[PDB]
Amino acid sequence: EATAGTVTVNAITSDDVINASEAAGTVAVSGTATGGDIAEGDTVTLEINGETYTTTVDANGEWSVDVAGSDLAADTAFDAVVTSSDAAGNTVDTTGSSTHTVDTEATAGTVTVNAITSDDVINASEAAGTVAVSGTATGGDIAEGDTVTLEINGETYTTTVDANGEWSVDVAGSDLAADTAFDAVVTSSDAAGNTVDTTGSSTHTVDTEATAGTVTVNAITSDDVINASEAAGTVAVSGTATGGDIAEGDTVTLEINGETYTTTVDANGEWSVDVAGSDLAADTAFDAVVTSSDAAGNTVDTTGSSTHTVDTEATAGTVTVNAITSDDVINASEAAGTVAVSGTATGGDIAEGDTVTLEINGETYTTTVDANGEWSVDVAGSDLAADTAFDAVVTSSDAAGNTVDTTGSSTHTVD
Ligand SMILES: [Ca+2]
Ligand SMILES: [Ca+2]
Ligand SMILES: [Ca+2]
Ligand SMILES: [Ca+2]
Ligand SMILES: [Ca+2]
Ligand SMILES: [Ca+2]
Ligand SMILES: [Ca+2]
Ligand SMILES: [Ca+2]
Ligand SMILES: [Ca+2]
Ligand SMILES: [Ca+2]
Ligand SMILES: [Ca+2]
Ligand SMILES: [Ca+2]
Ligand SMILES: [Ca+2]
Ligand SMILES: [Ca+2]
Ligand SMILES: [Ca+2]
Ligand SMILES: [Ca+2]
Ligand SMILES: [Ca+2]
Ligand SMILES: [Ca+2]
Ligand SMILES: [Ca+2]
Ligand SMILES: [Ca+2]
Ligand SMILES: [Ca+2]
Ligand SMILES: [Ca+2]
Ligand SMILES: [Ca+2]
Ligand SMILES: [Ca+2]
Ligand SMILES: [Ca+2]
């Protein structure tokens, strides 16, 4: 008889595992054959998934044969048999045996993209800066450290899946302002070298500006004029604010004589704020600015503007009293009758029709300034007989409503 040797089979591929790519092509199965009657040229036979493969032992005790990966994927064990002869021509089979494993599939998982910024809207501030785009990746062969790729506005951003299945990557807001749809692809692999991609989709919106409205300012006081009395107290400056993104509670800011005043737009599109007359007396124009924001948090100022007029003084004139009777003496027949006491009132804001008031002997006489700047009033002679000194006071006002008194004095004698 002939004598068997030793046959061995090397790993099936470098890791002894058949993956997808290997299973799809051809695999060199190799090994050794020596000892006994094994000689160069002895045929090596392998049956693998029912297919008979054959090669011959080379000159160094080695053999190799190309096997279809599909047969190795289907059959995880096989003998390799070398057939030999001794010189006498007895025959003998030497067997070596092989095992391997098969894994021809990686498993995708699940990938998601979170809202793009807290509100899934890119605003103006966000477009101008850096936004962190985040999400999840979990399931199947997705593991910590797998690559995440996002293409956004033609820019390729990458990160890696963290230990918790989340991922984040800093992205330019510009890019997000310009491209409102994209995918995150996560690429995973298994021990065997199989690879798989898992995709998640994201959309968002862009809104970079908030819309101004219309702001108006009412008259400054009833007549749009600041008088002295008004300048000395407080004035309610009011108006309206509506349209665009203006809403109740939006701040209204007015600067007037360098003082900053603020209130808030009420529920009816109206506003009001107490301003010191003195600032209004000092500064005859101002803007009222309402600061608003849209849903996305863009902000906008709406301006309305005010003018007004200022007049805080009346001007006193000149008042005189004529001689009391032609000779400036009250006689007995004058005392017994009525005397016309007369004079002038002119200058400043004194005007035709201004009130003239005389108190003589406790009795109050009044008349008005005529067209010529003179005045006269009939007075009891007895009163002039009883009181030899008195004032005439003329009360005048201006258009703004300031008022002034002008006084002239008189004395006379009695006989
Ligand atoms: Ca023999
Ligand atoms: Ca392999
Ligand atoms: Ca068979
Ligand atoms: Ca050969
Ligand atoms: Ca088998
Ligand atoms: Ca066997
Ligand atoms: Ca032989
Ligand atoms: Ca093996
Ligand atoms: Ca697998
Ligand atoms: Ca946002
Ligand atoms: Ca890309
Ligand atoms: Ca896109
Ligand atoms: Ca892996
Ligand atoms: Ca979204
Ligand atoms: Ca907007
Ligand atoms: Ca006024
Ligand atoms: Ca001003
Ligand atoms: Ca302005
Ligand atoms: Ca708002
Ligand atoms: Ca005005
Ligand atoms: Ca005046
Ligand atoms: Ca007289
Ligand atoms: Ca008197
Ligand atoms: Ca007047
Ligand atoms: Ca006199």
SSE map:
Elements: E1 6-9, E2 17-18, H1 20-24, E3 26-34, E4 43-48, E5 51-56, E6 62-68, H2 69-74, E7 77-85, E8 91-99, E9 101-102, E10 110-113, E11 121-122, H3 124-127, E12 130-138, E13 147-152, E14 155-160, E15 166-172, H4 173-178, E16 181-189, E17 195-203, E18 205-206, E19 214-217, E20 225-226, H5 228-232, E21 234-242, E22 251-256, E23 259-264, E24 270-276, H6 277-282, E25 285-293, E26 299-307, E27 309-310, E28 318-321, E29 329-330, H7 332-335, E30 338-346, E31 355-360, E32 363-368, E33 374-380, H8 381-386, E34 389-397, E35 403-411, E36 413-414
Parallel strand pairs: 2-9, 11-18, 20-27, 29-36
Antiparallel strand pairs: 1-3, 3-6, 4-5, 4-7, 7-8, 10-12, 12-15, 13-14, 13-16, 16-17, 19-21, 21-24, 22-23, 22-25, 25-26, 28-30, 30-33, 31-32, 31-34, 34-35
The chain binds calcium ion (25 copies).
Describe the structure.
It is classed as unknown function. The entry lists the keywords Ca2+-dependent, bacterial Ig-like fold, ice-binding adhesin, extender domain, unknown function. It forms a monomeric assembly. This protein is mainly beta and 415 residues long. It has four domains: 1-105, Immunoglobulin-like, CATH 2.60.40; 106-208, Immunoglobulins (Immunoglobulin-like), CATH 2.60.40; 209-311, Immunoglobulin-like, CATH 2.60.40; 312-415, Immunoglobulin-like (Sandwich). Strands 5-4-7-8 form a four-stranded antiparallel β-sheet. A hairpin with a 5-residue loop joins β16 and β17 (195-203). One calcium ion binds next to β29.
